[PDB]
Amino acid sequence: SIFRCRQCGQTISRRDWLLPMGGDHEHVVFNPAGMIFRVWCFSLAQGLRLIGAPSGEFSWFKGYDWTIALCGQCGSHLGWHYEGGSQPQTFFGLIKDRLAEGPA
């Protein structure tokens, strides 16, 4: 029921915080460098460090700008914080295989 950084165990999110964006919490997407990600949407996350300023370029979610989200402890890329949108204004898209699920 909680998600930790797979690399270092930093607390990041919770199963209760999964958000079905466009009907599903899971989106399979690729970036311009052709990397494929299995992204899980969460309402809320913690223990991250957001780097840079938001960008609308190549956004996988209509009306949202993204900032890269690193693990605040180990600096591992865990996904993106999304903002600037509507219903909801903000959320997190985290890469499923970079998280470890386990007991609270």
Binding site: V29, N31, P32, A33, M35, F58, S59, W60, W66, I68, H77, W80, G93
Partner: peptide
């Protein structure tokens, strides 16, 4: 590295 982290 930044290219691989872009959404």
């Amino acid at each position: 590295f930044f290219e691989q982290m872009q959404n």
